[PDB]
Structure 1
Amino acid sequence: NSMKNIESLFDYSAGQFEFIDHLLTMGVGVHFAALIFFLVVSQFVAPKYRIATALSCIVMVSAGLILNSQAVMWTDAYAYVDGSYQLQDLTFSNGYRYVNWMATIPCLLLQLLIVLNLKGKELFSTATWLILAAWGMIITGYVGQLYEVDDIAQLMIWGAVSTAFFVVMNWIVGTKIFKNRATMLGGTDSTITKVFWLMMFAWTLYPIAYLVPAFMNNADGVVLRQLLFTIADISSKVIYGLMITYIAIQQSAAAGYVPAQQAL
């Protein structure tokens, strides 16, 4: 799929190449640093909500491994020749980001439903529909970006089908949050509403990066998309995880879990 993405179309100045490489490496570092944080604070989370913080560890490592894979594919595919980085081997594509989403998006969705205090029948059915919608969004998007060079019209059609799933997923997420925030302890009924708007903002950056080929088909666009991915990843995975943990700890403390009370 490397020859299908716009990355394969351009030579890169040293500055452009090193910046992209440094974004990807910086990203590996932020995720594995947060992995340790989530690992260590899980002992301060009541059993009720401990899976939520554990799911963040899974998200961090999954995202960190992909970003680490990308950084090495990026340096494997290009060589500095005659004053610019030129494609040598067909080994880089964003398609692996989409495979990190198939597995990480369910994890991110499930930790939200856990701290909303859903359980039993409703948790199982709500997650199934959220995961089906999210996989439909991702799959249709993955097919679309296969055409970001050869057929932009087709990228837009698949993007619109993907956006329909996205809208429906957000309608479910939003409805559940607003119908269940009253059950939330420790005043986290107020915090959960900020998480909803963080998700809305951070998750909507991905379709924007998706569209870069249509409005900035050049080497600066490749840099820009990677920049947006980096901001979207840190906000949708790292910051979102920090807030889910804070909600887990706070509710734990309000529920009589002493380590949480000790920690907070």
Structure 2
Amino acid sequence: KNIESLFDYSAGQFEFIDHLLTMGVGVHFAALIFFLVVSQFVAPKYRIATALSCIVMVSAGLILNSQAVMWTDAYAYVDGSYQLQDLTFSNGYRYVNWMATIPCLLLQLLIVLNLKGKELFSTATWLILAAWGMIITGYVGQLYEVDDIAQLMIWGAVSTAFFVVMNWIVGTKIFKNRATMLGGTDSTITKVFWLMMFAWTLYPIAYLVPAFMNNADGVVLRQLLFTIADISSKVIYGLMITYIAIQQSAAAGYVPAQQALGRI
């Protein structure tokens, strides 16, 4: 049901996608160790924001690892090209993983925005419901990326509605709570918003690839887009969230944070 299954791949195409996914694994697990060691410099009220980046690194890292092994399982070099065998490859498992990872990305944002208690719980609940609506309708949509492009488009429009409303909640909370933020991170959090708008928008672009480039090179392009998007939305994002967490920790008087920033 996925366009990947439609084509044979050149050694070049096949190896590049393998390398993309493998590099993706390496980057996320390398970052995991960074987030782990810096977590001790985060104040208690923000420390979970950095823990969530650890959780996202392993979750994303595992899905990329799974995709890479699925990729090599599904194809074998036969008569001069990589051809589909008995096992299958699908991006559908990425969608399932987003059900977990996207709530984590959203929660660590709410934490460094200094949201608490009732507002935190209510905002998280609405954000996660919006995200799940987006992910589920998008998942259904890509089931038709071969059989019914029109259906892919309509489910994609519905998904985009959830996406836009989710982003509006995000932007509203960010620009409203920006003033509460310490250590100059009121400025930093603005860049985080735009990083999110940019990186997360790469995913619906990848989703539309079967509509504007239905060939083996389109398959490569989609994995390339996912790689840019994953690294930007999880790793670079997590680094900014953790920076913001440490800076606010220091400004709030957390001594290990102050000491850590002092060494650099």
- TM bin (shorter chain): over 0.9
Deviations 1:99-131, CA, capped at 9 Å, x for gaps: 111100000000000000000100000000000
Cα distance in structure 2, aligned partners of 1:207 and 1:258: 43
| 8 Å Cα contact 2:2/2:142 also seen in 1 | yes
Deviations 1:13-61, CA, capped at 9 Å, x for gaps: 0000000000000000000000000000000000010000000000000
Choose 85-94 or 134-143, whichever is displaced more: 85-94
Deviations 1:59-110, CA, capped at 9 Å, x for gaps: 0000000100000010000010010000002321001110111100000000
Cα distance in structure 1, aligned partners of 2:82 and 2:190: 45
Cα distance in structure 2, aligned partners of 1:228 and 1:49: 31
Cα distance in structure 1, aligned partners of 2:9 and 2:102: 32
Deviations 1:112-151, CA, capped at 9 Å, x for gaps: 0000000010000000000000000000000000000000
Q: State the match for 2:130 in structure 1.
A: 133
Q: Verify: 1:116 aligned to 2:96, yes or no.
A: no
| 8 Å Cα contact 2:70/2:88 also seen in 1 | yes
Cα distance in structure 2, aligned partners of 1:7 and 1:174: 35
Cα distance in structure 2, aligned partners of 1:191 and 1:56: 18
For the residue of structure 2 that corresponds to 1:47, the secondary structure is coil
Instruction: Spell out structure 1 runs of 4+ moving beyond 2 A.
Output: none
Deviations 1:203-232, CA, capped at 9 Å, x for gaps: 000000000000000000000000000000
Match of 2:74 among 77, 90, 94: 77
Choose 228-237 or 81-90, whichever is displaced more: 81-90
Q: State the match for 1:262 in structure 2.
A: 259
Q: Percent identity?
A: 100
Q: State the match for 1:178 in structure 2.
A: 175
- TM-fit CA distance, 1:243: 0.0
Cα distance in structure 2, aligned partners of 1:63 and 1:187: 30
Q: Which runs of 5+ in 2 are unaligned?
A: none
Cα distance in structure 1, aligned partners of 2:242 and 2:163: 25
- TM-fit CA distance, 1:237: 0.3
Deviations 1:178-219, CA, capped at 9 Å, x for gaps: 111100000100000000000000000000000000000000
Q: State the match for 2:52 in structure 1.
A: 55
For the residue of structure 2 that corresponds to 1:48, the secondary structure is coil
For the residue of structure 1 that corresponds to 2:76, the secondary structure is strand
| 8 Å Cα contact 2:2/2:145 also seen in 1 | yes
Match of 1:247 among 240, 244, 249: 244
Match of 2:27 among 27, 30, 36: 30
For the residue of structure 2 that corresponds to 1:79, the secondary structure is strand
| 8 Å Cα contact 2:2/2:146 also seen in 1 | yes
| CA RMSD between the two structures | 0.4
Cα distance in structure 2, aligned partners of 1:120 and 1:74: 44
Cα distance in structure 2, aligned partners of 1:190 and 1:22: 36
Choose 82-91 or 8-17, whichever is displaced more: 82-91
| 8 Å Cα contact 2:22/2:64 also seen in 1 | yes
Q: State the match for 1:199 in structure 2.
A: 196
TM-score, structure 2 normalization: 0.98
Deviations 1:147-178, CA, capped at 9 Å, x for gaps: 00000000000000000000000010000101
| 8 Å Cα contact 2:73/2:87 also seen in 1 | no
